[PDB]
Design a protein around this ligand. Structure first.
Ligand SMILES: [Mg+2]
Ligand SMILES: [Mg+2]
Ligand SMILES: [Mg+2]
Ligand SMILES: [Mg+2]
Ligand SMILES: [Mg+2]
Ligand SMILES: [Mg+2]
Ligand SMILES: [Mg+2]
Ligand SMILES: [Mg+2]
Ligand SMILES: [Mg+2]
Ligand SMILES: [Mg+2]
Ligand SMILES: [Mg+2]
Ligand SMILES: [Mg+2]
Ligand SMILES: [Mg+2]
Ligand SMILES: [Mg+2]
Ligand SMILES: [Mg+2]
Ligand SMILES: [Mg+2]
Ligand SMILES: [Mg+2]
Ligand SMILES: [Mg+2]
Ligand SMILES: [Mg+2]
Ligand SMILES: [Mg+2]
Ligand SMILES: [Mg+2]
Ligand SMILES: [Mg+2]
Ligand SMILES: [Mg+2]
Ligand SMILES: [Mg+2]
Ligand SMILES: [Mg+2]
Ligand SMILES: [Mg+2]
Ligand SMILES: [Mg+2]
Ligand SMILES: [Mg+2]
Ligand SMILES: [Mg+2]
Ligand SMILES: [Mg+2]
Ligand SMILES: [Mg+2]
Ligand SMILES: [Mg+2]
Ligand SMILES: [Mg+2]
Ligand SMILES: [Mg+2]
Ligand SMILES: [Mg+2]
Ligand SMILES: [Mg+2]
Ligand SMILES: [Mg+2]
Ligand SMILES: [Mg+2]
Ligand SMILES: [Mg+2]
Ligand SMILES: [Mg+2]
Ligand SMILES: [Mg+2]
Ligand SMILES: [Mg+2]
Ligand SMILES: [Mg+2]
Ligand SMILES: [Mg+2]
Ligand SMILES: [Mg+2]
Ligand SMILES: [Mg+2]
Ligand SMILES: [Mg+2]
Ligand SMILES: [Mg+2]
Ligand SMILES: [Mg+2]
Ligand SMILES: [Mg+2]
Ligand SMILES: [Mg+2]
Ligand SMILES: [Mg+2]
Ligand SMILES: [Mg+2]
Ligand SMILES: [Mg+2]
Ligand SMILES: [Mg+2]
Ligand SMILES: [Mg+2]
Ligand SMILES: [Mg+2]
Ligand SMILES: [Mg+2]
Ligand SMILES: [Mg+2]
Ligand SMILES: [Mg+2]
Ligand SMILES: [Mg+2]
Ligand SMILES: [Mg+2]
Ligand SMILES: [Mg+2]
Ligand SMILES: [Mg+2]
Ligand SMILES: [Mg+2]
Ligand SMILES: [Mg+2]
Ligand SMILES: [Mg+2]
Ligand SMILES: [Mg+2]
Ligand SMILES: [Mg+2]
Ligand SMILES: [Mg+2]
Ligand SMILES: [Mg+2]
Ligand SMILES: [Mg+2]
Ligand SMILES: [Mg+2]
Ligand SMILES: [Mg+2]
Ligand SMILES: [Mg+2]
Ligand SMILES: [Mg+2]
Ligand SMILES: [Mg+2]
Ligand SMILES: [Mg+2]
Ligand SMILES: [Mg+2]
Ligand SMILES: [Mg+2]
Ligand SMILES: [Mg+2]
Ligand SMILES: [Mg+2]
Ligand SMILES: [Mg+2]
Ligand SMILES: [Mg+2]
Ligand SMILES: [Mg+2]
Ligand SMILES: [Mg+2]
Ligand SMILES: [Mg+2]
Ligand SMILES: [Mg+2]
Ligand SMILES: [Mg+2]
Ligand SMILES: [Mg+2]
Ligand SMILES: [Mg+2]
Ligand SMILES: [Mg+2]
Ligand SMILES: [Mg+2]
Ligand SMILES: [Mg+2]
Ligand SMILES: [Mg+2]
Ligand SMILES: [Mg+2]
Ligand SMILES: [Mg+2]
Ligand SMILES: [Mg+2]
Ligand SMILES: [Mg+2]
Ligand SMILES: [Mg+2]
Ligand SMILES: [Mg+2]
Ligand SMILES: [Mg+2]
Ligand SMILES: [Mg+2]
Ligand SMILES: [Mg+2]
Ligand SMILES: [Mg+2]
Ligand SMILES: [Mg+2]
Ligand SMILES: [Mg+2]
Ligand SMILES: [Mg+2]
Ligand SMILES: [Mg+2]
Ligand SMILES: [Mg+2]
Ligand SMILES: [Mg+2]
Ligand SMILES: [Mg+2]
Ligand SMILES: [Mg+2]
Ligand SMILES: [Mg+2]
Ligand SMILES: [Mg+2]
Ligand SMILES: [Mg+2]
Ligand SMILES: [Mg+2]
Ligand SMILES: [Mg+2]
Ligand SMILES: [Mg+2]
Ligand SMILES: [Mg+2]
Ligand SMILES: [Mg+2]
Ligand SMILES: [Mg+2]
Ligand SMILES: [Mg+2]
Ligand SMILES: [Mg+2]
Ligand SMILES: [Mg+2]
Ligand SMILES: [Mg+2]
Ligand SMILES: [Mg+2]
Ligand SMILES: [Mg+2]
Ligand SMILES: [Mg+2]
Ligand SMILES: [Mg+2]
Ligand SMILES: [Mg+2]
Ligand SMILES: [Mg+2]
Ligand SMILES: [Mg+2]
Ligand SMILES: [Mg+2]
Ligand SMILES: [Mg+2]
Ligand SMILES: [Mg+2]
Ligand SMILES: [Mg+2]
Ligand SMILES: [Mg+2]
Ligand SMILES: [Mg+2]
Ligand SMILES: [Mg+2]
Ligand SMILES: [Mg+2]
Ligand SMILES: [Mg+2]
Ligand SMILES: [Mg+2]
Ligand SMILES: [Mg+2]
Ligand SMILES: [Mg+2]
Ligand SMILES: [Mg+2]
Ligand SMILES: [Mg+2]
Ligand SMILES: [Mg+2]
Ligand SMILES: [Mg+2]
Ligand SMILES: [Mg+2]
Ligand SMILES: [Mg+2]
Ligand SMILES: [Mg+2]
Ligand SMILES: [Mg+2]
Ligand SMILES: [Mg+2]
Ligand SMILES: [Mg+2]
Ligand SMILES: [Mg+2]
Ligand SMILES: [Mg+2]
Ligand SMILES: [Mg+2]
Ligand SMILES: [Mg+2]
Ligand SMILES: [Mg+2]
Ligand SMILES: [Mg+2]
Ligand SMILES: [Mg+2]
Ligand SMILES: [Mg+2]
Ligand SMILES: [Mg+2]
Ligand SMILES: [Mg+2]
Ligand SMILES: [Mg+2]
Ligand SMILES: [Mg+2]
Ligand SMILES: [Mg+2]
Ligand SMILES: [Mg+2]
Ligand SMILES: [Mg+2]
Ligand SMILES: [Mg+2]
Ligand SMILES: [Mg+2]
Ligand SMILES: [Mg+2]
Ligand SMILES: [Mg+2]
Ligand SMILES: [Mg+2]
Ligand SMILES: [Mg+2]
Ligand SMILES: [Mg+2]
Ligand SMILES: [Mg+2]
Ligand SMILES: [Mg+2]
Ligand SMILES: [Mg+2]
Ligand SMILES: [Mg+2]
Ligand SMILES: [Mg+2]
Ligand SMILES: [Mg+2]
Ligand SMILES: [Mg+2]
Ligand SMILES: [Mg+2]
Ligand SMILES: [Mg+2]
Ligand SMILES: [Mg+2]
Ligand SMILES: [Mg+2]
Ligand SMILES: [Mg+2]
Ligand SMILES: [Mg+2]
Ligand SMILES: [Mg+2]
Ligand SMILES: [Mg+2]
Ligand SMILES: [Mg+2]
Ligand SMILES: [Mg+2]
Ligand SMILES: [Mg+2]
Ligand SMILES: [Mg+2]
Ligand SMILES: [Mg+2]
Ligand SMILES: [Mg+2]
Ligand SMILES: [Mg+2]
Ligand SMILES: [Mg+2]
Ligand SMILES: [Mg+2]
Ligand SMILES: [Mg+2]
Ligand SMILES: [Mg+2]
Ligand SMILES: [Mg+2]
Ligand SMILES: [Mg+2]
Ligand SMILES: [Mg+2]
Ligand SMILES: [Mg+2]
Ligand SMILES: [Mg+2]
Ligand SMILES: [Mg+2]
Ligand SMILES: [Mg+2]
Lengths: 97, 147
RNA sequence: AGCCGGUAGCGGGCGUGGAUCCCUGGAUGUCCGAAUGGGGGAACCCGGCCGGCGGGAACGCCGGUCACCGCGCGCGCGGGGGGAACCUGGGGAACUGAAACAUCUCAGUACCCAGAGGAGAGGAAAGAGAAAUCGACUCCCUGAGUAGCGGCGAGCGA
RNA sequence: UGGUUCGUGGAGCCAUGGGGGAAUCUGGGCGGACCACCGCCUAAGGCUAAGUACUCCGGGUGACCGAUAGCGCACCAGUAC
RNA sequence: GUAGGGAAACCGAGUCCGAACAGGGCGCAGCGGCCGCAAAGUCCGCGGCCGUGGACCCGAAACCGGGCGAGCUAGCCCUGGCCAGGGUGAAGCUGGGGUGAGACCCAGUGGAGGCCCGAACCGGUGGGGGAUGCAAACCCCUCGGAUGAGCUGGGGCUAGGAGUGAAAAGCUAACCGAGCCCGGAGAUAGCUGGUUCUCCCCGAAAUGACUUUAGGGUCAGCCUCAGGCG
RNA sequence: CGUAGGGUUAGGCGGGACCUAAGGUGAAGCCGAAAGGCGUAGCCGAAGGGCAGCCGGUUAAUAUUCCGGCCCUUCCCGCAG
RNA sequence: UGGUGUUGGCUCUUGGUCGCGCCUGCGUAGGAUAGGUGGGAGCCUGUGAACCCCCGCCUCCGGGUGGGGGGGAGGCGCCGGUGAAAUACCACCCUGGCGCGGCUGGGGGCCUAACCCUCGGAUGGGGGGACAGCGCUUGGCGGGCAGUUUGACUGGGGCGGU
RNA sequence: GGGCCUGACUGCGAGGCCUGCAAGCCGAGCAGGGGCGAAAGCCGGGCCUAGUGAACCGGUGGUCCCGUGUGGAAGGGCCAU
């Protein structure tokens, strides 16, 4: 539940459609919708913890962009990052996007 | 997932080698423990440049020596020693052979590199191997003579 | 050429040396309010630092300064709040209609939220769609209640 | 799942929450399932006047009202209550 | 509008069904003396009626959105306060008795308790009165509790399909089987009501069929107008 | 009740420049489409804690406030120990 | 609640499979047990024959194959017996089975480092542990809640009847 | 009661019955290809009047009508059920 710090993936609203009956393509009379109600589809958010500049940075990121966190860590090497706060490291890291 | 090993690793692979592991393994064990790194294009480049740079300085030593096969192997080091008949009073050491080899014939050598178990104590014609690099073993012909 | 607002009166003044009045710029602008030193039951209360007043150390007053967040190497810049409709975006009903009702309708409307701005949005083809064609987007007319969509119902509608 | 006229339909297109997951022009998307042929177009970065909407505000004009009308208010009204 | 027929391909004064040159469906054809006149059709105005809109006006009970409310009331939380006087007399304790030791018994002391009587205080049993009240729940008489699951001040928290409830669908600001305000909104109302000047001509129906229909509709019958026929 | 004029005097009463209670708010931190919801510290929050004034006189109207008498608190500075 | 992501390491046991080593096939008939279709008219042997004894392994009870040791210059085909197809020898592939391996599905154990909990101490310790949680998806239970439906005629309506 | 047969026709259909609609009903005749009869002729189910169900959605056989740039295909139409 919430937002990928990397991809920006947010929760979206989707309908949940309940149907009944036999498809036409299978020779049935056709499908009848017996309900539509809203629901949400959440991003698959997980925690990735990483050490960068001897500090522990953690990201909330959709599983699809789990590799993008480590790629950020790589691009981090060219950076003067030590001495900074982990809030500060993450900001620099994020800025690399 | 492709990672580059940073160490030899029991039934996985050898240092510098590019292997395929489950992402879990790589992310939560291999990478954090410094044992490997992602086979990114950017650090695949680097491994290649290391393979390249090591292979330069190695084949460059297998040439610094082979060239020193050419200076020696084409001469005799002649050592006059005070001696009587065949047995020498003092002796010729490797430390001597070297300090000899510099004075005449010019070439500087490392005594310790030369394969001479105990100091030579007799006159005659000696063939002594140098080994300035393994695989590149040199033949030093040394004439120890009287007066 | 009168004038000291509505507003006359008492009691006093000003104006051809150009008043009142009108327009523009500027100065002053208690306290509250985003309200931002801190607190708080808005318009009250209580502080730190620098400077000043008083006899002034206690006490009090005056001037300056002190919130938080973001971006950039403590300092700079910026943000915050408002605005009748309009606009985009994120959410999003029901009565009702279907002469009952569930899909459908009402309607992506009402409404909440965020954001902009004098507009906003969109915009320079990974388009259209049959022409060997056109040539960003927006807006009006038309195409057309067509094509279609539809418990092929009610209706919806490029 | 949404968007489109398209309510699962022969359902393409545009968008994307989940999973898998490429290539760099001999690459790719599209022309309504799919295939071939023939064409069109170049995704995954950004900006961009004008023509358009509105009316708190100023002005002009009414086969508009004329104090029970016309704004709730012609008046000290978003007041008294 | 000038061509229709056909699901369509398509043909075309025809075309569709069909083997059909059959049969049928649906279609095709002005006046006067080249002149004028009329006309298909179409445009605009006007009027009647229809569709879509709130669509003749007024009226629900309700539904939904967003807010406002626990200064009333209900529960809980924090901190305070209050409960005259009187009565009964638990445990314990002390002493006496008892016994092997005891249980236990008696006396005194003691002062317990959703104990008793009864003010304040909190209630509200029965009756009478009030009934355009003194009062939108009052008054008098009577009556319940009154150290407790007691009462009460101040400061707080919990709310709308939600709270709260020693439970009555009670209470949540004098009407709660789903609060109030504003909005959707002119909801909908096949129901009730109302529908405004004058004269003149005509003049019904209350049946049939069908109808989640029966006090509502569609068609038909019956009224009226215009044109034609005669 | 209409018009006017007067009238409320504090270091010691009450509250503030003191404390904390429920609760509220809230660095850190957590969460949530937006709005927003939480949250140890801290801060706010009193009719609880803390804190120095009694008796009399006076006005048309104020008085532990003015006056009189007798007492007291804190802060600043100084002197002495 | 299945699948899948987050989600990893080692092992055992089973199942799928491919890659090898392999072994394996018993009708009339034909010596003996003939799996196919070709290459095939010759092969083998100090890389020690005819044959003698002991073990393994399937065992159509006749053997087949795998080993150990003597003997240590011998044996089987082609012909022909021969049947549907025939013999030595090399392949390409089956029936079934075995052991190595890859690649995997299912179970069991263990591990730690994801993830969760916890510890005055926190780049760490301890505990749970790839489970749980959480994402997407599958089917189910579901008046806890929501939206509704619940006919007409009728000597009132209901009940009955229609 | 018996013999032969499948007219328990295909393409139509003048004209009517009934009737608010939609339905329902009767039907001579012509053409195609048949059955029975020597022939006249009869036969488009049953002496008759009940034995039934509009449209929507879908199934199956046929047709080869449409086919989203084009050829196919998907899917539909049409006839029958
Ligand atoms: Mg679903
Ligand atoms: Mg289907
Ligand atoms: Mg089909
Ligand atoms: Mg459907
Ligand atoms: Mg992780
Ligand atoms: Mg994905
Ligand atoms: Mg993935
Ligand atoms: Mg004045
Ligand atoms: Mg005067
Ligand atoms: Mg004057
Ligand atoms: Mg001038
Ligand atoms: Mg000015
Ligand atoms: Mg001032
Ligand atoms: Mg201010
Ligand atoms: Mg302030
Ligand atoms: Mg503040
Ligand atoms: Mg100062
Ligand atoms: Mg002074
Ligand atoms: Mg001073
Ligand atoms: Mg002063
Ligand atoms: Mg100041
Ligand atoms: Mg200041
Ligand atoms: Mg803002
Ligand atoms: Mg703004
Ligand atoms: Mg929107
Ligand atoms: Mg948003
Ligand atoms: Mg939306
Ligand atoms: Mg919106
Ligand atoms: Mg809702
Ligand atoms: Mg509805
Ligand atoms: Mg409505
Ligand atoms: Mg309607
Ligand atoms: Mg309805
Ligand atoms: Mg209705
Ligand atoms: Mg109803
Ligand atoms: Mg409805
Ligand atoms: Mg409507
Ligand atoms: Mg809609
Ligand atoms: Mg609006
Ligand atoms: Mg704004
Ligand atoms: Mg403009
Ligand atoms: Mg613009
Ligand atoms: Mg713009
Ligand atoms: Mg471009
Ligand atoms: Mg047209
Ligand atoms: Mg239809
Ligand atoms: Mg719509
Ligand atoms: Mg999709
Ligand atoms: Mg849709
Ligand atoms: Mg369809
Ligand atoms: Mg589609
Ligand atoms: Mg996606
Ligand atoms: Mg190309
Ligand atoms: Mg390609
Ligand atoms: Mg695409
Ligand atoms: Mg595509
Ligand atoms: Mg395509
Ligand atoms: Mg295209
Ligand atoms: Mg294109
Ligand atoms: Mg833009
Ligand atoms: Mg311009
Ligand atoms: Mg514009
Ligand atoms: Mg304008
Ligand atoms: Mg104006
Ligand atoms: Mg006038
Ligand atoms: Mg008036
Ligand atoms: Mg008025
Ligand atoms: Mg008047
Ligand atoms: Mg006005
Ligand atoms: Mg008025
Ligand atoms: Mg007034
Ligand atoms: Mg005809
Ligand atoms: Mg005709
Ligand atoms: Mg005309
Ligand atoms: Mg009409
Ligand atoms: Mg309307
Ligand atoms: Mg109307
Ligand atoms: Mg009307
Ligand atoms: Mg109404
Ligand atoms: Mg109600
Ligand atoms: Mg309801
Ligand atoms: Mg409801
Ligand atoms: Mg509401
Ligand atoms: Mg609400
Ligand atoms: Mg209360
Ligand atoms: Mg209360
Ligand atoms: Mg207390
Ligand atoms: Mg209390
Ligand atoms: Mg009491
Ligand atoms: Mg007592
Ligand atoms: Mg008592
Ligand atoms: Mg005692
Ligand atoms: Mg005793
Ligand atoms: Mg006693
Ligand atoms: Mg007592
Ligand atoms: Mg006593
Ligand atoms: Mg009692
Ligand atoms: Mg009692
Ligand atoms: Mg009394
Ligand atoms: Mg009292
Ligand atoms: Mg009571
Ligand atoms: Mg009573
Ligand atoms: Mg009585
Ligand atoms: Mg009474
Ligand atoms: Mg009474
Ligand atoms: Mg009475
Ligand atoms: Mg009463
Ligand atoms: Mg009484
Ligand atoms: Mg009594
Ligand atoms: Mg009493
Ligand atoms: Mg009693
Ligand atoms: Mg009691
Ligand atoms: Mg009592
Ligand atoms: Mg008592
Ligand atoms: Mg009691
Ligand atoms: Mg108590
Ligand atoms: Mg209380
Ligand atoms: Mg209170
Ligand atoms: Mg209270
Ligand atoms: Mg509560
Ligand atoms: Mg509440
Ligand atoms: Mg509320
Ligand atoms: Mg409610
Ligand atoms: Mg309910
Ligand atoms: Mg409700
Ligand atoms: Mg409830
Ligand atoms: Mg109670
Ligand atoms: Mg009841
Ligand atoms: Mg109220
Ligand atoms: Mg009430
Ligand atoms: Mg209700
Ligand atoms: Mg109420
Ligand atoms: Mg409102
Ligand atoms: Mg509406
Ligand atoms: Mg309306
Ligand atoms: Mg209704
Ligand atoms: Mg009227
Ligand atoms: Mg008459
Ligand atoms: Mg009748
Ligand atoms: Mg009738
Ligand atoms: Mg009938
Ligand atoms: Mg009918
Ligand atoms: Mg009715
Ligand atoms: Mg009629
Ligand atoms: Mg008549
Ligand atoms: Mg006439
Ligand atoms: Mg007075
Ligand atoms: Mg004093
Ligand atoms: Mg005090
Ligand atoms: Mg101070
Ligand atoms: Mg305070
Ligand atoms: Mg405090
Ligand atoms: Mg909060
Ligand atoms: Mg707290
Ligand atoms: Mg403080
Ligand atoms: Mg206090
Ligand atoms: Mg106190
Ligand atoms: Mg004080
Ligand atoms: Mg005193
Ligand atoms: Mg007084
Ligand atoms: Mg006074
Ligand atoms: Mg005094
Ligand atoms: Mg001193
Ligand atoms: Mg599930
Ligand atoms: Mg898993
Ligand atoms: Mg374990
Ligand atoms: Mg462990
Ligand atoms: Mg662990
Ligand atoms: Mg364990
Ligand atoms: Mg799991
Ligand atoms: Mg999570
Ligand atoms: Mg699934
Ligand atoms: Mg499900
Ligand atoms: Mg229900
Ligand atoms: Mg159920
Ligand atoms: Mg409804
Ligand atoms: Mg029902
Ligand atoms: Mg029903
Ligand atoms: Mg009901
Ligand atoms: Mg029903
Ligand atoms: Mg009835
Ligand atoms: Mg009856
Ligand atoms: Mg009746
Ligand atoms: Mg009757
Ligand atoms: Mg009767
Ligand atoms: Mg009757
Ligand atoms: Mg019945
Ligand atoms: Mg009957
Ligand atoms: Mg015959
Ligand atoms: Mg006829
Ligand atoms: Mg008829
Ligand atoms: Mg015949
Ligand atoms: Mg014939
Ligand atoms: Mg014959
Ligand atoms: Mg006939
Ligand atoms: Mg019969
Ligand atoms: Mg019959
Ligand atoms: Mg239908
Ligand atoms: Mg129907
Ligand atoms: Mg159909
Ligand atoms: Mg095509
Ligand atoms: Mg064709
Ligand atoms: Mg196409
Ligand atoms: Mg082809
Ligand atoms: Mg074709
Ligand atoms: Mg074909
Ligand atoms: Mg077909
Ligand atoms: Mg077909
Ligand atoms: Mg048909
Ligand atoms: Mg036919």
């Amino acid at each position: 539940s919430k937002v990928c710090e990397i991809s920006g993936k947010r929760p979206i609203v989707a309908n949940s459609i309940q149907r009944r009956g036999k498809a036409k393509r299978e020779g049935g009379v056709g499908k009848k919708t017996t309900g539509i109600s809203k629901r949400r589809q959440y991003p698959n958010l997980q925690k990735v913890r990483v050490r960068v500049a001897g500090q522990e940075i953690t990201f909330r990121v959709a599983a699809s962009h789990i590799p993008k966190v480590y790629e950020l860590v790589e691009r981090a090497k060219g950076l003067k990052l030590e001495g900074l706060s982990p809030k500060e490291i993450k900001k620099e890291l994020l800025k690399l996007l | 997932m492709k990672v580059i090993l940073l160490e030899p690793l029991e039934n996985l692979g050898d240092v510098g080698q590019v292997v395929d592991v489950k992402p879990g393994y790589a992310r939560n064990y291999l990478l954090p423990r410094g044992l490997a790194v992602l086979a990114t294009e950017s650090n695949l480049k680097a491994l290649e440049a290391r393979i390249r740079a090591q292979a330069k300085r190695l084949a460059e030593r297998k040439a610094e020596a082979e060239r020193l096969k050419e200076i020696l192997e084409n001469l005799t080091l002649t050592i006059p020693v005070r001696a009587g008949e065949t047995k020498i009073y003092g002796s010729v050491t490797a430390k001597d052979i070297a300090e000899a080899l510099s004075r005449q014939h010019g070439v500087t050598i490392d005594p310790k590199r030369l394969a001479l178990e105990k100091p030579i104590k007799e006159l005659g014609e000696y063939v002594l191997t140098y080994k300035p690099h393994p695989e590149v073993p040199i033949q030093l012909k040394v004439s120890v003579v009287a007066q």
